[PDB]
Amino acid sequence: QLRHIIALWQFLSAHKSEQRLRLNKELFREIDVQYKEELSTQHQRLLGTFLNEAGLDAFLLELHEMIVLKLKGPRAANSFNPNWSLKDTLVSYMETKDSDILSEVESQFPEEILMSSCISVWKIAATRKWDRQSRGG
Amino acid sequence: LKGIPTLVYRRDWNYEHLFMDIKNKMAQSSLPNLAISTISGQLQSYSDA
């Protein structure tokens, strides 16, 4: 019904991107190159420590809505400085409307993710989602 | 100061005024856990997405 639409929309939006992950394509192609860099080993180890106890099914959904609604490309460093932490911008984005699962990303997410490596965190989260829903079943 | 002649500059495709309009008119709930499996099993094709 129509009370689901936006959530339905963002679900399907993320779903399209994760299809782009499993067909091995260049999956953004329009956003700026400054955010499209790799994680180091320490940041992705702390990311895996987060993702071992994480509600992935809401995490990558909110992260993908924020990236494809806010990190558009040219003039995206206005309020989204690429040296902040992801925890502060996600809780600041998410006290306006949403009443979801907030204590897990408050007590468990890494404090020093260094914003310029943004979408590789999403790639690691979605490939962990794919390993869970494909390697298991 | 209501009817001042004014041309508009910014092109309202940020998707966010639209979102704040849906939270204003209606009481938008979240998705059920079974409807997620329903709409994800039936949309494995990319063209359907």
Curated annotation (Swiss-Prot), chain A:
Subcellular location: Cytoplasm, Cytosol; Lipid droplet
Observed phenotype of the null mutant: No visible phenotype. Males and female are fertile and produce normal-sized litters. Mice do not spontaneously develop Moyamoya disease, a chronic occlusive cerebrovascular disease. Mice are however more susceptible to Rift Valley fever virus infection. Mice show elevated expression of MMP9.
Role: Atypical E3 ubiquitin ligase that can catalyze ubiquitination of both proteins and lipids, and which is involved in various processes, such as lipid metabolism, angiogenesis and cell-autonomous immunity. Acts as a key immune sensor by catalyzing ubiquitination of the lipid A moiety of bacterial lipopolysaccharide (LPS) via its RZ-type zinc-finger: restricts the proliferation of cytosolic bacteria, such as Salmonella, by generating the bacterial ubiquitin coat through the ubiquitination of LPS.
Free-text comment about domains: Composed of an N-terminal stalk, a dynein-like core comprised of two catalytically active and four inactive ATPase domains, and a C-terminal E3 module. The ATPase regions do not generate movement but rather act like an intricate molecular 'switch'.
Subunit field text: Monomer. Interacts with UBE2L3/UBCH7; UBE2L3/UBCH7 is the most efficient ubiquitin-conjugating enzyme E2 for the ubiquitin ligase activity. Interacts with UBE2N/UBC13; promoting 'Lys-63'-linked ubiquitination of target proteins.
Family: Belongs to the AAA ATPase family.
Name the UniProt record assigns to this protein: E3 ubiquitin-protein ligase RNF213
Organism: Mus musculus
Higher taxonomy: Eukaryota, Metazoa, Chordata, Craniata, Vertebrata
Underlying gene: Rnf213
Entire protein: shown range: 5014 to 5148 of 5148
